[PDB]
Scaffold this active site. Structure first.
Site, short mmCIF file in Angstrom:
data_model
loop_
_atom_site.label_atom_id
_atom_site.label_comp_id
_atom_site.label_asym_id
_atom_site.label_seq_id
_atom_site.Cartn_x
_atom_site.Cartn_y
_atom_site.Cartn_z
N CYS A 38 0.82 -1.22 0.00
CA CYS A 38 0.00 0.00 0.00
C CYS A 38 0.84 1.25 0.00
O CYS A 38 2.07 1.22 -0.08
CB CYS A 38 -0.76 -0.07 1.30
SG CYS A 38 -2.00 -1.35 1.16
N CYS A 42 -2.23 4.24 3.72
CA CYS A 42 -3.38 3.30 3.48
C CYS A 42 -4.46 3.51 4.53
O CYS A 42 -4.20 3.67 5.72
CB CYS A 42 -2.82 1.88 3.60
SG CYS A 42 -4.17 0.69 3.32
N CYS A 69 -3.31 -2.94 -3.13
CA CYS A 69 -4.53 -2.74 -2.29
C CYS A 69 -5.59 -1.99 -3.09
O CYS A 69 -5.38 -0.86 -3.52
CB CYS A 69 -4.00 -1.95 -1.09
SG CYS A 69 -5.32 -1.13 -0.15
N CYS A 72 -5.61 1.56 -2.11
CA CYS A 72 -4.40 2.40 -2.41
C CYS A 72 -4.05 2.34 -3.89
O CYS A 72 -3.26 3.14 -4.40
CB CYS A 72 -3.27 1.75 -1.61
SG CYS A 72 -3.40 2.21 0.13
ZN LIG Z 1 -3.80 0.12 1.10
#
Ligand SMILES: [Zn+2]
Length: 139
Positions: A38, A42, A69, A72
């Site tokens: 991330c 995050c 992610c 992210c």
């Molecule tokens: Zn993340």
DNA sequence: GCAAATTAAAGCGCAAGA
DNA sequence: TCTTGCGCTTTAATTTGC
């Protein structure tokens, strides 16, 4: 402040935990425990630094065989502020012509002109259509 | 090792107000 | 006639257990 050979993963982590939007875009952090990487800020949750490494960009992390992610990956890190500069331009258009211009924005996100204002606040952080009006009042 | 469950947070949609 | 604030939901990721 305090920067090693362009990768103080030690403080980068301090940035990852500090959610410093100034290290976001500069590097990522890949938790091998989950196979994700991330940004330093995050918003989903975190894993120990132990299984966490840092990358110059999400593609490097993406090259480590990790899954970016979905929180992210779609949003922008340091590029965040740059996409916010784009919205300010949206203010110009809303005060440059006569009819207001959100059609390109609304179509890009799939929402109405009022929700575009809501996005302007989400990214800028706290002023949707009001940021549009203020900028227009000073621009 | 591999999975599921939980917690956390952001943003979209709705509402109400001016 | 237009606007903004707030809430709630959904999404996502992390943690622990066996
Ligand atoms: Zn993340």
């Amino acid at each position: 402040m305090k920067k090693a050979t362009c990768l103080t993963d030690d403080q980068r982590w301090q940035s990852v935990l500090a959610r410093d939007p100034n290290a976001d875009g500069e590097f990522v952090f890949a938790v091998r425990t989950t196979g994700i990487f991330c940004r330093p800020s995050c918003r989903a949750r975190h894993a120990l630094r132990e299984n966490v490494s840092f990358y110059a960009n999400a593609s490097e992390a993406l090259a480590a065989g990790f899954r970016p992610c979905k929180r992210c990956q779609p949003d922008k890190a340091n590029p965040r502020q740059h996409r916010l500069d784009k919205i300010t331009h949206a203010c110009r258009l809303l005060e440059q012509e006569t009819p207001v211009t959100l059609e390109a924005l609304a179509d890009q996100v799939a929402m109405s002109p009022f929700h575009l204002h809501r996005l302007f606040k989400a990214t800028t952080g706290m002023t949707p259509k009001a940021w549009q009006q203020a900028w227009r009042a000073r621009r």
